[model samples]
Target: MSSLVYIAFQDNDNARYVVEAIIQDNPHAVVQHHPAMIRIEAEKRLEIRRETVEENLGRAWDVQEMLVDVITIGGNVDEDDDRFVLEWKN
Candidate 1:
């Protein structure tokens, strides 16, 4: 409403794994499927956890590894070995 955070990725099987995981984590997040990609948006903050993605992907995953597929994003970034966070901050 006030501010927003979003992450998008290619529309494919691999990316869908992570997309579904993100939707599982953020219930309030809105998802829109475009012609070629999908985007997930939150009001202010959004996080992509390596653990969650790993579970859905059925393998070990590094949060940093997902960045290559980030088609678009908006917000400040906070990252660590376990998670990637995006927030709209003052």
Candidate 2:
């Protein structure tokens, strides 16, 4: 089984919606939160297809845009690859 971690910086309640969406979609995945960051552990091989994200988020969503919300981060796949680890610092 493959797995990876994702950190999201959420300064306000609106961002909480994102966290909730992720958890609702992937109940098996681990979810945690810090001051303003939400951490997610996802199955590496699972599908995070655009349609899935959009359906969950109820809007057009891009994975890359989500990463920008991270203040400090590390351990993700190379830009050329679709699968990778995710980490963050803040």
Candidate 3:
């Protein structure tokens, strides 16, 4: 159906780095800043790489750290220590 995949985070300093990394990795993504949330959506797939976030954050990061700021997520997730990915299964 060509449905979009999305992820949302709470709007805050910690979440900012993750959002920035997501933007850098998912160049085709669309970002929306709501009152207290940030939503990133991509047509097919989206990825958040831990190394990229660490670069933007200037600190070591783990994929689990993202759970703290994640408010919502859509699409199938394949998460591990190195990356967080979302895509349609069918």
Candidate 4:
């Protein structure tokens, strides 16, 4: 599978927490950080459910708001693209 990964979060703390949570959920997942972006990779797929995110943040978390933060950093999920993708396989 492809090793590429991508993610966007509101701030460094948010990014760090999300990455840590992903690692906790999937021990096999690899994580990396670049400025305001957090990258996560697994042999198959990595998912961050809305409920899980909301619980972690202790607030209603809208994917659009996350996208807005991403957009400000020049990274965003394409309108026609799935928010999450399985690497290298259809």
lDDT of 4 at 90: 25
User: RMSD in angstroms, candidate 1?
Assistant: 7.1
Q: Which stretches of candidate 1 lie over 4 Å from their true place?
A: 14-18, 21-25, 45-70, 75-90
Model 2: lDDT to the true structure: 0.51
In angstroms, give how far residue 77 of model 4 lies from its true place: 10
lDDT of each: 0.67, 0.51, 0.67, 0.47
Give lDDT tens digits, candidate 4, residues 23-54.
66965656666555655443443444445534
Supply candidate 1's per-residue lDDT for 61.
54
Model 2 alpha-carbon drift over 4 Å, by segment = 21-26, 45-74, 80-90
The candidate with the higher lDDT, 1 or 4, is 1
User: Compared with the true structure, what per-residue lDDT tens digits does model 1 show for residues 1-90?
Assistant: 687777677645665767667687865867777555677666776667777656857744554666545566755677887777668653
In candidate 3, what are the lDDT values of residues 1-90, reduced to their tens digit?
486787677756765767677587865767777556777666666677877656857643544676656566665778887776667543
Give the backbone clash total of model 3: 0
Q: Using alpha carbons, what is the TM-score of model 1?
A: 0.42
TM-scores, all candidates, are 0.42, 0.39, 0.41, 0.36
**Runs in model 4 with CA error above 4 Å?**
1-12, 45-67, 71-86
